[PDB]
C-alpha cells in the first residue's frame, strides 16, 4: 500500500490545509472554531466524501453525467459543481501569484520583511524587538499590506493594476496551461519528493513555532473554547464549509477521481484514511500557525487576536515571521515558497483538468472532434486570467476575500451537500444506494453512513443555513472594514450562480419533457440503467 500512500499523499495537503484553515480558525477566535469543525467532520464530511466517491465509481462517468443515472430531475447538481470549480479556479491561483511574488522577493541577502527601512514602509514602523522596549506597525504586516498588496482604502478604489503581480499570475497560468496541454504530472520518481517535501517543511515550521518563547499562549488560544460568546452562526458556517472545502466535495472532482479506480480497490478504507489524515494535517499545522502567533504576541506586547490580520494573509504574515527566526532566513524562505508553489500547483492542475474534462464532455463532437483541445484549454486559461486580474489591483484583496467567502465556500457548499444527501437518501433510496454499494465494494455502508446521509447532513446543513439567515451578520475584511451593499450583492450573486443551477435545471427539464405534469415529475424521477 506504500505507493497508494504516496499518490493520495500528494492528494491530501493543499493550500486549504496550510492556508485556509489557520486564518478561518484565527478569525473565529481559535478554540471555538474546532468544536463545529469536528462536529461537521464526523457528522457529514467523511460520509459525503464517501458518497461522492461512490457516485463517481458507480456511474463511471463525469460529475454531470452521474445524476442522469441517479436522478434526472436533480441533474443541476453537476452544473452547480462545475460552476463552483470554474469560480474556484479563478481566485485560487491568486494565492500562487502571491507566493511567486514572495519567492522572487526572497532572492536577496536580507529578506525585505525582516526589517523596516525601505521606501514603502510607513513612519510608524517599529521593530518587533523594539516595540516592547500602540500606533506602531510590524514590518511584516505592512510589507504584506503595502509592498505585495499595496492595499487600497476599500473595494470602491481599485487603483492601479499591479504589473508585477499581473506577470506573476501570467507565469503561473502559463505553467498550468503547458502542464495541462502537454499532460505533465507527477508520475515518475518525482512523486516521492513531491509527496514528502511539504510534510518535511511543515514539520520544520511546527518545530520552530513550538520552540518559540510565546508558543504556550498561542496553543492556549488555539485550543481553549469560547462557547459562552463565540457561538455565532459565522463560526458554524466557516467550520462546516471548511470541511467541505478541504475535501474536493461539492465540486464534482471527486467523482471523476473515483471513476479512475476500480471495484477491486479498498473503497471506504481509502476514504476514511484520506479524510482523517487530511483533517489531521490541518489540525497539526494549526499548532505551528498559532505558536508563531503566540510568539508574535509575546514579542509585540499585544493580544494574540490583534497580532496579525484576520484574513487570507495570515499564511503570508505568520510563516515569513517564522522563517525570519531561523538560521540563514533566505534559504528557508525560498524552500517554503517553493513548497507552497508545488503544493498549490498540483491541486490547481487537478482542478483545471477536471474542469476541462467536465466541459468537453458536454460537447465532445465540437470540442474534441471539430476543434483541437488546445484551443479550448487556451480559451479557459485566458478567460480565467482576465477574470483573476480583478484581484491583482491595489484593491484586489477585498475582491479576493469576497470570492473566497462566497464563490466557492459558504452556503453554496451546504446547498450542494444537502441536495446530494437528500436525493440519495430519500428520492433515490437509501436501501437502493446501500445495495449498489454492496454490489460494488462488497459490504453495506452501515448505520453510520446511512443515518448520516438520511438525517445528520441534511439537518446540519439546513440548521446552519437557517441560523445564518436568522442571525445574519455581514461580511467584513479583516475585522474593521465593512463591505458596501453592492459588494455584498456581488458576493451573493457569486453564490447564487452555483445555487440557482438546481432549480433552473429542474424547471428546464420539466418543461422540455412531454406528458402531464405528474407524469413529467414521475418519469424524471426514475433512474436509468
Amino acid at each position, epitope marked *: 500500500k506504500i505507493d497508494f500512500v504516496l499518490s493520495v499523499a500528494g492528494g491530501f495537503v493543499g493550500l486549504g490545509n496550510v492556508w485556509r484553515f489557520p486564518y478561518l480558525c484565527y478569525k473565529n477566535g481559535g478554540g471555538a472554531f474546532l468544536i463545529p469543525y469536528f462536529i461537521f467532520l464526523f457528522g457529514s464530511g467523511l460520509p459525503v466524501f464517501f458518497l461522492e466517491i461512490i457516485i463517481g465509481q458507480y456511474t463511471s462517468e463525469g460529475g454531470i453525467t452521474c445524476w442522469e443515472k441517479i436522478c434526472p430531475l436533480f441533474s443541476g447538481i453537476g452544473y452547480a459543481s462545475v460552476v463552483i470549480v470554474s469560480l474556484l479556479n479563478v481566485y485560487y491561483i491568486v494565492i500562487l501569484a502571491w507566493a511567486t511574488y514572495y519567492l522572487f522577493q526572497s532572492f536577496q541577502k536580507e529578506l525585505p520583511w525582516a526589517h523596516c527601512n525601505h521606501s514603502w514602509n510607513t513612519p510608524h514602523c517599529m521593530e518587533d524587538t523594539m516595540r516592547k522596549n500602540t500606533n506602531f506597525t510590524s514590518p511584516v504586516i505592512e510589507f504584506w499590506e503595502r509592498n505585495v498588496l499595496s492595499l487600497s482604502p476599500g473595494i470602491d478604489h481599485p487603483g492601479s493594476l499591479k504589473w508585477d503581480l499581473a506577470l506573476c499570475l501570467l507565469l503561473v497560468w502559463l505553467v498550468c496551461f503547458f502542464c495541462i496541454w502537454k499532460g505533465v504530472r507527477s508520475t515518475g520518481k518525482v512523486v516521492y519528493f513531491t509527496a514528502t517535501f511539504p510534510f518535511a517543511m511543515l514539520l520544520v515550521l511546527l518545530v520552530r513555532g513550538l520552540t518559540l518563547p510565546g508558543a504556550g499562549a498561542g496553543i492556549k488560544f488555539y485550543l481553549y473554547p469560547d462557547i459562552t460568546r463565540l457561538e455565532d452562526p459565522q463560526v458554524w458556517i466557516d467550520a462546516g464549509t471548511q470541511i467541505f472545502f478541504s475535501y474536493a466535495i461539492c465540486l464534482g472532482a471527486m467523482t471523476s477521481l473515483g471513476s479512475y479506480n476500480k471495484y*477491486h480497490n479498498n473503497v471506504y478504507r481509502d476514504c476514511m484514511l484520506l479524510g482523517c489524515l487530511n483533517s489531521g494535517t490541518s489540525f497539526v499545522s494549526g499548532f505551528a500557525i498559532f505558536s508563531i502567533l503566540g510568539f508574535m504576541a509575546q514579542e509585540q506586547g499585544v493580544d494574540i487576536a490583534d497580532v496579525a490580520e484576520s484574513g487570507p494573509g495570515l499564511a503570508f504574515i505568520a510563516y515569513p515571521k517564522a522563517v525570519t527566526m531561523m538560521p540563514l532566513p533566505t534559504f528557508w524562505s525560498i524552500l517554503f515558497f517553493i513548497m507552497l508553489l508545488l503544493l498549490g500547483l498540483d491541486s490547481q492542475f487537478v482542478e483545471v483538468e477536471g474542469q476541462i474534462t467536465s466541459l468537453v464532455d458536454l460537447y465532445p463532437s465540437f470540442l474534441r472532434k471539430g476543434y483541437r483541445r488546445e484551443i479550448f484549454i487556451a480559451f479557459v486559461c485566458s478567460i480565467s486570467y482576465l477574470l483573476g486580474l480583478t484581484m491583482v489591483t491595489e484593491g484586489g484583496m477585498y475582491v479576493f476575500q469576497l470570492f473566497d467567502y462566497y464563490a466557492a465556500s459558504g452556503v453554496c457548499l451546504l446547498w450542494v451537500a444537502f441536495f446530494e444527501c437528500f436525493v440519495i437518501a430519500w428520492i433515490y433510496g437509501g*436501501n*437502493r444506494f*446501500s*445495495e449498489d454499494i*454492496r*454490489d460494488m465494494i*462488497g*459490504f*453495506p455502508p452501515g448505520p453510520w453512513m446511512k443515518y448520516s446521509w438520511a438525517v445528520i447532513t441534511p439537518v446540519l446543513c439546513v440548521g446552519c443555513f437557517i441560523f445564518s439567515l436568522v442571525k445574519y451578520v455581514p461580511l467584513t475584511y479583516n475585522k474593521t472594514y465593512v463591505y458596501p451593499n453592492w459588494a455584498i450583492g456581488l458576493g451573493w450573486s457569486l453564490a447564487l450562480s452555483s445555487m440557482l443551477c438546481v432549480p433552473l435545471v429542474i424547471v428546464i427539464r420539466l418543461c422540455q419533457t412531454e406528458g402531464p405534469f405528474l407524469v413529467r415529475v414521475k418519469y424524471l424521477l426514475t433512474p436509468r440503467e
Partner: antibody
Amino acid sequence: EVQLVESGGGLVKPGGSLKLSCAASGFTFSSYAMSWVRQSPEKRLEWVAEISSGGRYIYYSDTVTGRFTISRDNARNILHLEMSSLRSEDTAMYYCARGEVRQRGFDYWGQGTTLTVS
Amino acid sequence: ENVLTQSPAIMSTSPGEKVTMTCRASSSVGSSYLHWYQQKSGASPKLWIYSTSNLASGVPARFSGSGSGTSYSLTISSVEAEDAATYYCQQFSGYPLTFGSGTKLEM
C-alpha cells in the same frame, strides 16, 4: 440470525421443472443477500445463484445460467429457486445461504433439501 | 472460473497432534475474499474462518489460517475427536463463486 429452512425437494423426471423454497426467520430477510449452494452426491460443493437484498442484482453459475431462475419475496421473507430444465447432473442437495457481506462469507446455512432425477 | 483446489483430500489424524491444510486458486484471490467452512458428516456446512485470519463465532481458538495471492492454508493447534469434519475453502472475489475440493479429517 437463527433459522433457515428449505422445502420443495422431491423426485422428478429428467428435463422436468421444480421450484425450491427457503423460509427465513430470526432476522430481517430484506436486508441481507441470499445465495443458493449445491452439494452433489460426491459431496462436492458448487455455487448456483445469488440474489441481492432487494433483488436488483442477480448472478448465476455458468452451468445453470440458462435454466435456473432465482427470486425472493421480501414481504413474505421466503427465498425461491426455480428450475426449468433439470439435467442428470442436477441431482444434489440444495442449501440456501446468507451472503450479505462478501468479505465475511456465508454466515448461516439451511437444513437443505434433496433433489433426484430418474 | 477461478478453480480452487485443496491438497490433503484425505488426512488420517490422531488426537493431540497438530494438523494443517492448504488451499490454492487458479487466480489471485484477495485476502479478504477467502473463507473456510466446516461441514460435519450428515450436517450442513458452517462458517469457520473469514478474511483468511478471522475465526467465526463457534470455532474454538485452536484454529488459525493464513495465506495470500493464490496460496492459502488453515492450521489446527491441537486436533480433537470433535474436529473430525470436512473443510472447504471458498473465494468471494469474483463470480462464479467456487469452493475448494474439500479435506475431510479421518479422526
